[PDB]
Amino acid sequence: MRTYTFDQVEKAIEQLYPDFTINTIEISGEGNDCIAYEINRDFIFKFPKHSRGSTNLFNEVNILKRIHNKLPLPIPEVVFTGMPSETYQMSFAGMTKIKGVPLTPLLLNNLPKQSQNQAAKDLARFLSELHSINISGFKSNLVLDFREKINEDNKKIKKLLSRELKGPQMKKVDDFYRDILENEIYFKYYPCLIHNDFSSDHILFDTEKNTICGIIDFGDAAISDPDNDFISLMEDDEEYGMEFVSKILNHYKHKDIPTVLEKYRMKEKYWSFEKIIYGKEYGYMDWYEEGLNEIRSI
Numbered sequence: 001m002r003t004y005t006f007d008q009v010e011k012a013i014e015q016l017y018p019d020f021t022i023n024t025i026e027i028s029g030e031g032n033d034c035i036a037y038e039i040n041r042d043f044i045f046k047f048p049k050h051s052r053g054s055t056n057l058f059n060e061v062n063i064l065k066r067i068h069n070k071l072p073l074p075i076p077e078v079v080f081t082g083m084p085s086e087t088y089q090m091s092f093a094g095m096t097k098i099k100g101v102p103l104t105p106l107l108l109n110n111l112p113k114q115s116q117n118q119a120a121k122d123l124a125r126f127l128s129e130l131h132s133i134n135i136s137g138f139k140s141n142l143v144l145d146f147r148e149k150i151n152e153d154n155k156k157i158k159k160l161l162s163r164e165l166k167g168p169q170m171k172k173v174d175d176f177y178r179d180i181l182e183n184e185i186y187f188k189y190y191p192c193l194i195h196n197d198f199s200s201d202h203i204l205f206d207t208e209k210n211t212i213c214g215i216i217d218f219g220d221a222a223i224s225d226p227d228n229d230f231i232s233l234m235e236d237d238e239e240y241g242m243e244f245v246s247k248i249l250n251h252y253k254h255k256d257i258p259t260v261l262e263k264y265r266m267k268e269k270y271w272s273f274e275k276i277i278y279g280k281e282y283g284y285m286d287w288y289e290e291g292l293n294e295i296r297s298i
Ligand SMILES: Nc1ncnc2c1ncn2[C@@H]1O[C@H](CO)[C@@H](O)[C@H]1O
Pocket: 028, 029, 030, 031, 034, 036, 044, 076, 077, 095, 096, 097, 098, 099, 201, 202, 216, 217
């Protein structure tokens, strides 16, 4: 992985945008893909930590542009883009800064019922438009067919762990993957554009108006199961819980809440395997060891 100096961030922008004067530059945060710089308190520029990170950023840019102005909550607008090299699909992208603070579970529970209800409706209306976006232009690099993902993960687990597990333990991996595969409820969705990292850290809130003012981080958006954007909100400790998320489901007019719960339980167990794969794909060796240890003693 790579980090950046303030000097580098500014030379990279100066090369392609020589008339853009940078007065203030600060780290605003960090994901798995990119380090984020706040520029002139007006822009957030993402710089890729690695090539995989690049690819997501290139994806994020193309998605931001395709969905510009079609959705009922503010989203970053792409203003500045970098260049491809032998290492990055995109050296950086600068987007408009959306002001506000993450809508943490804590922050949401403290609001009056009226603003809570309103945040539940604003989220439903947001997803409902997001999931309605025409997919016809999105190529396979943005399509994430879940059956293929589960089959592809299975092969990665096996390539990665074949020398790391015993007999009975790989058998349990097999049994788990065979049961997932058997269950038709995971694969029979109408594919569509999903945020795919749809959690409280990516929901920005205006505490002066008590209203959600932005959705951010589109680096994982893909064409996949719209239930993914409800289940990423349901996680009980880190996220909103089922009361609040059921309000989103009902404002969204979701027809099959029980299926949503079922997908959530599956994804809860699946996390261990995700941790191994993400482990080696994004560099995180702590994730890898935790997931391994969990499969070892599940
Ligand atoms: N367009 C944006 N406006 C405000 N913050 C952003 C924007 N894009 C990314 N970020 C911030 O930097 C972090 C890591 O990517 C985000 O979770 C968020 O705080």
